[PDB]
Structures are given as C-alpha cells and as structure tokens.
Amino acid sequence: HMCDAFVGTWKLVSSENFDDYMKEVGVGFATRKVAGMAKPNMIISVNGDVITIKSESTFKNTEISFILGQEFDEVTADDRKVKSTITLDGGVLVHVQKWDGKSTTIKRKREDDKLVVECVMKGVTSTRVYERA
C-alpha cells in the first residue's frame, strides 16, 4: 500500500556505471556485454504480502517473488545462485544479496515519475533509471 507506488511496468531509460558495477560483482565479459546492451522492463506487482519483481529483456527474463524481511534463494540474471533479503526502509526497497562470502545491495526508489535503481558493490555504484511503460 505504500508499496503501491512501485507497482507497474518500468522501462529502462538510462544507465551509468553498470559495466563497472558488474565487473566488481564478478560478472563475466560475455554476459556484461550482452546484458549491458539490453533495455529491460522491470515489472512490479503485489498480491497480499507477496511482492513479485520480473525483469524482461532480450537477454534474460528473471522473476522473484518474496515477502519483506524473509530471506529467499534467487538466481540472478547472470546465473549466480544467491541468498536475498528485501525490506522496505523509509520508503525504499532494499535488496541485499549474499553469495560466496560477498554482498551487494540494490536499492529501488521512486523519484518524481521514475523508478531509480542504485546498485552498490564495495565502493562501485551504478544508477539505472526506469520510466512507466
């Protein structure tokens, strides 16, 4: 219901430093190059306490469905198996992924008519902006 403001279909309109963020995370060259090209839609829906986030692109389609604060297993777009927890803190969806002893955090926030996705690995940050389809 505050989560309401995220629901919808959001198309990528800009990206900054995503290749460097992916490098830091450990994504391989072929997947960086092809994923980097893509123009994914991020589709967010809610049904009760279950939130679903889908990403659809020419590269890969991904889907997670989860309850806030309850850890789950995820397969990332670059085919890594991680343990994820998503919480809603001060209005921002905060997605933490843990794998192989590492961690990254992906934040989704509403800013004006945009959905802004900030990805952080160590000190490398990427910002991706999406707008309503």
Ligand X SMILES: Cc1c(Cc2ccccc2)nc(C(C)(C)C)c(-c2nnn[nH]2)c1-c1ccccc1
Residue 130 known to bind ligand:
yes
Q: Cβ(44)–Cβ(7) under 8 Å?
A: yes
Q: Give 26 or 91: the residue with its C-beta nearer to ligand X.
A: 26
Residue 128 known to bind ligand:
yes
- Chain residues binding ligand X by CB under 6 A are 22, 25, 27, 35, 38, 40, 42, 55, 57, 59-60, 76-78, 97, 104, 106, 117, 119, 128
Q: Give 88 or 103: the residue with its C-beta nearer to ligand X.
A: 103
DSSP 59: S
Q: How far is the CB of 69 from ligand X (least distance, A)?
A: 20
Find where tokens 């991020």 sit: 42
Find where tokens 């997947």 sit: 31
The two three-digit tokens of residue 107, written as one number: 């934040």
Q: How far is the CB of 54 from ligand X (least distance, A)?
A: 9
Q: Give 48 or 54: the residue with its C-beta nearer to ligand X.
A: 54
Helices (H), the chain: 18-25, 29-37
Find where tokens 């279950």 sit: 50
Binding residues for a fatty acid: 128-130
